[PDB]
Write an enzyme that holds these catalytic residues in place. Structure first.
Site, PDB file in Angstrom:
ATOM      1  N   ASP D 150       0.826  -1.216   0.000  1.00 37.49           N
ATOM      2  CA  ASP D 150       0.000   0.000   0.000  1.00 37.49           C
ATOM      3  C   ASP D 150       0.860   1.266   0.000  1.00 37.49           C
ATOM      4  O   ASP D 150       0.559   2.225  -0.715  1.00 37.49           O
ATOM      5  CB  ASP D 150      -0.947   0.027   1.202  1.00 37.49           C
ATOM      6  CG  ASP D 150      -1.945  -1.111   1.191  1.00 37.49           C
ATOM      7  OD1 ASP D 150      -2.237  -1.655   0.101  1.00 37.49           O
ATOM      8  OD2 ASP D 150      -2.442  -1.466   2.280  1.00 37.49           O
ATOM      9  N   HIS D 177      -5.610  -3.484   5.374  1.00 39.50           N
ATOM     10  CA  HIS D 177      -5.303  -3.873   4.006  1.00 39.50           C
ATOM     11  C   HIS D 177      -6.540  -4.490   3.358  1.00 39.50           C
ATOM     12  O   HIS D 177      -6.591  -5.693   3.091  1.00 39.50           O
ATOM     13  CB  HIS D 177      -4.115  -4.844   3.990  1.00 39.50           C
ATOM     14  CG  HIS D 177      -3.601  -5.135   2.618  1.00 39.50           C
ATOM     15  ND1 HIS D 177      -2.898  -4.209   1.879  1.00 39.50           N
ATOM     16  CD2 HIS D 177      -3.704  -6.237   1.839  1.00 39.50           C
ATOM     17  CE1 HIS D 177      -2.586  -4.729   0.706  1.00 39.50           C
ATOM     18  NE2 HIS D 177      -3.065  -5.958   0.656  1.00 39.50           N
TER      19      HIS D 177
HETATM   20  N1  LIG Z   1      -0.100  -8.906   2.302  1.00 42.21           N
HETATM   21  C1  LIG Z   1      -0.480  -8.451   1.096  1.00 42.21           C
HETATM   22  O1  LIG Z   1      -0.675  -7.144   0.776  1.00 42.21           O
HETATM   23  C2  LIG Z   1      -0.611  -9.382   0.062  1.00 42.21           C
HETATM   24  C3  LIG Z   1      -0.181  -9.050  -1.215  1.00 42.21           C
HETATM   25  C4  LIG Z   1      -0.284  -9.947  -2.278  1.00 42.21           C
HETATM   26  C5  LIG Z   1      -0.831 -11.205  -2.077  1.00 42.21           C
HETATM   27  N2  LIG Z   1      -1.271 -11.563  -0.803  1.00 42.21           N
HETATM   28  C6  LIG Z   1      -1.826 -12.895  -0.547  1.00 42.21           C
HETATM   29  O2  LIG Z   1      -0.695 -13.767  -0.577  1.00 42.21           O
HETATM   30  C7  LIG Z   1      -1.240 -15.098  -0.758  1.00 42.21           C
HETATM   31  C8  LIG Z   1      -0.401 -15.890  -1.753  1.00 42.21           C
HETATM   32  O3  LIG Z   1      -0.447 -15.171  -2.990  1.00 42.21           O
HETATM   33  P1  LIG Z   1       0.268 -15.769  -4.327  1.00 42.21           P
HETATM   34  O4  LIG Z   1      -0.024 -14.842  -5.431  1.00 42.21           O
HETATM   35  O5  LIG Z   1       1.672 -16.162  -4.056  1.00 42.21           O
HETATM   36  O6  LIG Z   1      -0.611 -17.114  -4.549  1.00 42.21           O
HETATM   37  P2  LIG Z   1      -0.010 -18.436  -5.242  1.00 42.21           P
HETATM   38  O7  LIG Z   1      -1.129 -19.390  -5.429  1.00 42.21           O
HETATM   39  O8  LIG Z   1       0.829 -18.058  -6.401  1.00 42.21           O
HETATM   40  O9  LIG Z   1       0.920 -18.978  -4.064  1.00 42.21           O
HETATM   41  C9  LIG Z   1       0.321 -19.909  -3.206  1.00 42.21           C
HETATM   42  C10 LIG Z   1       1.452 -20.666  -2.529  1.00 42.21           C
HETATM   43  O10 LIG Z   1       1.028 -21.036  -1.184  1.00 42.21           O
HETATM   44  C11 LIG Z   1       1.235 -22.453  -1.068  1.00 42.21           C
HETATM   45  N3  LIG Z   1       0.329 -23.076  -0.059  1.00 42.21           N
HETATM   46  C12 LIG Z   1      -0.994 -23.229  -0.071  1.00 42.21           C
HETATM   47  N4  LIG Z   1      -1.343 -23.861   1.052  1.00 42.21           N
HETATM   48  C13 LIG Z   1      -0.241 -24.104   1.758  1.00 42.21           C
HETATM   49  C14 LIG Z   1      -0.038 -24.704   2.938  1.00 42.21           C
HETATM   50  N5  LIG Z   1      -1.105 -25.169   3.582  1.00 42.21           N
HETATM   51  N6  LIG Z   1       1.187 -24.839   3.461  1.00 42.21           N
HETATM   52  C15 LIG Z   1       2.277 -24.339   2.747  1.00 42.21           C
HETATM   53  N7  LIG Z   1       2.042 -23.721   1.524  1.00 42.21           N
HETATM   54  C16 LIG Z   1       0.788 -23.619   1.061  1.00 42.21           C
HETATM   55  C17 LIG Z   1       0.948 -22.973  -2.466  1.00 42.21           C
HETATM   56  O11 LIG Z   1       1.506 -24.271  -2.646  1.00 42.21           O
HETATM   57  C18 LIG Z   1       1.676 -21.961  -3.317  1.00 42.21           C
HETATM   58  O12 LIG Z   1       3.077 -22.243  -3.438  1.00 42.21           O
HETATM   59  C19 LIG Z   1      -2.691 -14.894  -1.245  1.00 42.21           C
HETATM   60  O13 LIG Z   1      -3.575 -15.099  -0.138  1.00 42.21           O
HETATM   61  C20 LIG Z   1      -2.723 -13.450  -1.638  1.00 42.21           C
HETATM   62  O14 LIG Z   1      -4.042 -12.896  -1.527  1.00 42.21           O
HETATM   63  C21 LIG Z   1      -1.153 -10.650   0.266  1.00 42.21           C
END
Ligand SMILES: NC(=O)c1ccc[n+]([C@@H]2O[C@H](COP(=O)([O-])OP(=O)(O)OC[C@H]3O[C@@H](n4cnc5c(N)ncnc54)[C@H](O)[C@@H]3O)[C@@H](O)[C@H]2O)c1
Ligand SMILES: NC(=O)c1ccc[n+]([C@@H]2O[C@H](COP(=O)([O-])OP(=O)(O)OC[C@H]3O[C@@H](n4cnc5c(N)ncnc54)[C@H](O)[C@@H]3O)[C@@H](O)[C@H]2O)c1
Ligand SMILES: NC(=O)c1ccc[n+]([C@@H]2O[C@H](COP(=O)([O-])OP(=O)(O)OC[C@H]3O[C@@H](n4cnc5c(N)ncnc54)[C@H](O)[C@@H]3O)[C@@H](O)[C@H]2O)c1
Ligand SMILES: NC(=O)c1ccc[n+]([C@@H]2O[C@H](COP(=O)([O-])OP(=O)(O)OC[C@H]3O[C@@H](n4cnc5c(N)ncnc54)[C@H](O)[C@@H]3O)[C@@H](O)[C@H]2O)c1
Lengths: 314, 314, 314, 314
Positions: D150, D177
């Protein structure tokens, strides 16, 4: 003679569904629509040695050409569940998808049968109907929430426990397509089957949460696709046969209903050339089944209202 | 009541192939194997209201349990082509995959019909044969390189050009399953069709490059999956019908052959209770077709030796 | 200052490479090109708090706009290996991709530095050079095969064995980028390091097979992406620094050469404002290294010829 | 030096985040965890010429080994948004993921800084706190909801509109957020800037919806990954610098707070050797900004309660 459009043809359900449609002699033209991959999926399917002419369409620019002259439109277009989620959690993505695609249907093939697979079905049918109303072409006999997979599951599970051929089994399932709104009428099963109340409760729960059971089993790799292709093809084939004058075609489907307090409700329907020929109603039920109907109505109404509310905001 | 195994059942071909098999009353047991996702795919398919018992298997330890007692094994397990690549370009990955999985077949279901889909078929069938020889269970009447999609394509394309029902068209396609080794015998087509030369040349070329045209249409998202599922399923059903004593069942397939100096070659095969009943051979062909056979031989022999040599380096 | 285009920006290397470029103060304009997903990738990167202006382009129609006014063009566009394959197995897909993209570079930014990542590098650089020759804009000082990951790997592996900081270690690596054509000159390592021949041999093989090691560790989910983004970024930064007048910038790279009988060869290059300022040659080597050079030349010449012959057929 | 664990390291954020962490001299040990692909990702990263020792871990059995001795743990593990969804629509999947992974942290590295990226952050941080409380190891100075993206966005957008270098712009963002809970304090921006109200409302809208903007632009292919990796890396670096005694390090982050009636809230935090050195508070704001704070409380409270209530059912 039937022309069938699959909206969301490139997805997990869409591809095997389109395969089953292509394989059927009931289909003469198959039009496939998606926002990605459709030209490849269509090329692939077009090589199959059946009479259905296959064409792929890509992006909203080509959607009108896809829908022109369609008899049936099936809509798996949407986003599936991850483990933990309810079908309702998908509302904010799929509501807009269903509203957009059904708007195109109302404009370009308003007389087609509209078969909605996209979840949550309990709200996406209400959305579909209101979009058709807004366009001035609302025919409630032609709009179907596909719940056929619930019936297919019920048949399979009843057959397993009793050692029957699943093809010989028919279990009416009523209500809607989400958790407790899925009401299998085991009392009305053919052939007649008897279960103790504890077995019946577990069986009922097994049917109700079967979608979640598959989501868990896939562990993040989507939801039921192949069994849904089967059930969707089954429903479309039933509908197309009925449109061709076959008599006594009965399928359960989530439709505009006056059978209960709910504006939409799933019951067995006699299909025919107008789509819904006759709503056969709930019929005779057990006390157990009666209670489930009562308990489900609050959720159904909430889901119905949600879909209707969503359409107001557009 | 055929027991069928699919190795690579979670892939693009594997899933729709497994659906078609599960849908068929010819199948009583469907065992699925892959290195990932099998339990979810099996869970999905097990809900379908047909008699076939479905179970998913995952990892080396469970492969034997997937294979034991099978009448037919289909192996789409392997990596697919990208645009530009030949099927031969897949050799260095898929040779090891086919060797491993067919070694397991040789150990746990040596009497089954082994149907290899994994490319390049022109080399992977020789691999399969050499692996079975090593285990002392090589039966050349039960090992099949699935070329059925070439025939299915030929039927469709002939039907489209002549305005025929492709259900009624049957084109023998001989040689192998790679580019110029694919030899459609249009002269032997039923019904007999007469094409002007420019249409005949375009038709022949279209059949030969059909796989590449789908790869190009999918633009990196794989190769033919749905039409290959159809074709694989057709071939299994032909095998099963013949096993159940149906007479006059004829399919083209890349097998151990004495028709040319190529030790493996595709011709129409009369199938029987024990697999290949009789190789019907090349038969009478046109001069154009004779030339194509002669031109195919150097490539086929090279692909064959390549597969054989790979096994000798282990 | 510098305008950098990344062709194949949506890929495994493309995205993190683009991230590292966007993060750099050396870059004021970042154009991203692919056949899918570029708009989303550019939107993602545009939110980062650095000065580089990001724009995403999609499809060949937009390739000129992407290329106009570029100082450097990086080309990871192509297809990655699966386990078992050599880099040469990628030739039939990537040769056409590189020829097409580098022809667009020749037309729309002939003055730019062309950094080719797409494999096999030993053939794709000859392809690039011949395409520029056909357009009459060939400049051998501006065409680079990115071998930087071989140096990076050698640095890391030497540092681990001697308990050193890999940031303090520099190992010249010469020849090409495939198998035994990768020749780490451990005798010229700074700091000076002594291994007995058995350790040296093991270390040399590790450096040579490191790309295959990662392919096998990823088990079908691609090849080196993140470390290649690092190596790709490093090489581009060295090139831009040199273009900005920085002195004593030395990097090994596969380029047009007269250091051996190979017309293309990787040696340490002094970089300047016009690309290659001076080829610093092979220098003094051990008998072990000298033998490796002699044994590498046949493969290099064959790979070079293969690339040249490919462009002759266009 | 810093031993950092990344949980979800194979994902869209996880991989480029891990690259950025591997590239930094601040990190001495990088442990990567996921349910798939980590060995390949670790292999890839381990070749980079920096001192950080990279290890990959796979499956919940190896999770304790990944966490032991860690100073910082970053958690992108979870499912991302599809277009139309809110971050709260992810709750029913990601809640359980975060609870499981943070329970392991509480058991195996209770003294570490816990940085939660997984969404919805407004609920997942409260879940983390309550999980740590259940294990009797709750330290509110060490638990951080990463809102850094942000701030990075705000900086870029302000710099764009005012023709500034975004690297010297700093815009505090407070609250949470999610949508309207994202409150950019443009009045506190350095250097000072002033916009007409219609512009300021547009700028504020842009910052608040920036996540959805990227999600829509990726059209189903995920959410912000590269910019989030940058933002997550920045925050970890800030945190690690402060742990090494660097002074004046300030980052906004969603933490246990008593600046408002919300139990958790994001404000600028002076980071120190123990984690949060001092919460710098909301400070002096405009009436526009005050209104937004007031408007945001009900939503923030609801998301907090949701997270809290979830842990109470375990
Ligand atoms: N904090 C923020 O501002 C912010 C910013 C961007 C994304 N996010 C969030 O981050 C998260 C991940 O985003 P992404 O784009 O990398 O998604 P993605 O699907 O590309 O990555 C998911 C990863 O998490 C792993 N995973 C799922 N369950 C798991 C578990 N139980 N134990 C270990 N690993 C597990 C998956 O295998 C995969 O490698 C999402 O919830 C997204 O909304 C938060
Ligand atoms: N009715 C049922 O009992 C039942 C059963 C199973 C699944 N479903 C639902 O079916 C839907 C599809 O599931 P899936 O497994 O195929 O998901 P999927 O993601 O595998 O495929 C969905 C397809 O829809 C396409 N799509 C999305 N938005 C589109 C748009 N705006 N225009 C055109 N195409 C668009 C996607 O590109 C994709 O190809 C989900 O909502 C799922 O919950 C319903
Ligand atoms: N016979 C033909 O005419 C014909 C037709 C189409 C495709 N093919 C070939 O079929 C193969 C698969 O194509 P696809 O589209 O299904 O590709 P795909 O990538 O979608 O699926 C391949 C499947 O193979 C599985 N697999 C890989 N190694 C395995 C192993 N060691 N054990 C068990 N499973 C393993 C993968 O997990 C994956 O599920 C390719 O080689 C393709 O070229 C042949
Ligand atoms: N020089 C080296 O040492 C070195 C190191 C690593 C990888 N590589 C090579 O880099 C290449 C890319 O690897 P990757 O892991 O990024 O693969 P990838 O498949 O993840 O990404 C490749 C990208 O190129 C794009 N692309 C393909 N054809 C295109 C076209 N015609 N026009 C525009 N974009 C196109 C794809 O869409 C994709 O986005 C591979 O050939 C790999 O072998 C070379």
């Amino acid at each position: 003679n039937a022309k069938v459009a699959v909206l969301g043809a490139s997805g997990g359900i869409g591809q095997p569904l389109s395969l089953l449609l292509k394989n059927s002699p009931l289909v003469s033209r198959l039009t496939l629509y998606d926002i990605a991959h459709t030209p490849g999926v269509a090329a692939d399917l077009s090589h199959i040695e059946t009479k259905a002419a296959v064409k792929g369409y890509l992006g909203p620019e080509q959607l009108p050409d896809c829908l022109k002259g369609c008899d049936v439109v099936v809509i798996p277009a949407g986003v599936p569940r991850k483990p933990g989620m309810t079908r309702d959690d998908l509302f904010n993505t799929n509501a807009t998808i269903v509203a957009t695609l059904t708007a195109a249907c109302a404009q370009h093939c308003p007389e087609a049968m509209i078969c909605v697979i996209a979840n949550p079905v309990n709200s996406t049918i209400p959305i579909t109907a209101e979009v058709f109303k807004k366009h001035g072409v609302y025919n409630p006999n032609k709009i179907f929430g596909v719940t056929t997979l619930d019936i297919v599951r019920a048949n399979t599970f009843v057959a397993e426990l009793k050692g029957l051929d699943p093809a010989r089994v028919n279990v009416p399932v009523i209500g809607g397509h989400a958790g407790k709104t899925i009401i299998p009428l085991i009392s009305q099963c053919t052939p007649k089957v008897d279960f103790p109340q504890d077995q019946l409760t577990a069986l009922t729960g097994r049917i109700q949460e079967a979608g979640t059971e598959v989501v868990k089993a896939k562990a993040g790799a989507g939801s039921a696709t192949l069994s849904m292709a089967y059930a969707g093809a089954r429903f479309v084939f039933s509908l197309v046969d009925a449109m061709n004058g076959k008599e006594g075609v009965v399928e359960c489907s989530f439709v505009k209903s006056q059978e209960t307090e709910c504006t939409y409700f799933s019951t067995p329907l006699l299909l025919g050339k107008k789509g819904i020929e006759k709503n056969l109603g709930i019929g005779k039920v057990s006390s157990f089944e009666e209670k489930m109907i009562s308990d489900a109505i609050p959720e159904l109404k909430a889901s119905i209202k949600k879909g209707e509310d969503f359409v107001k905001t557009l």
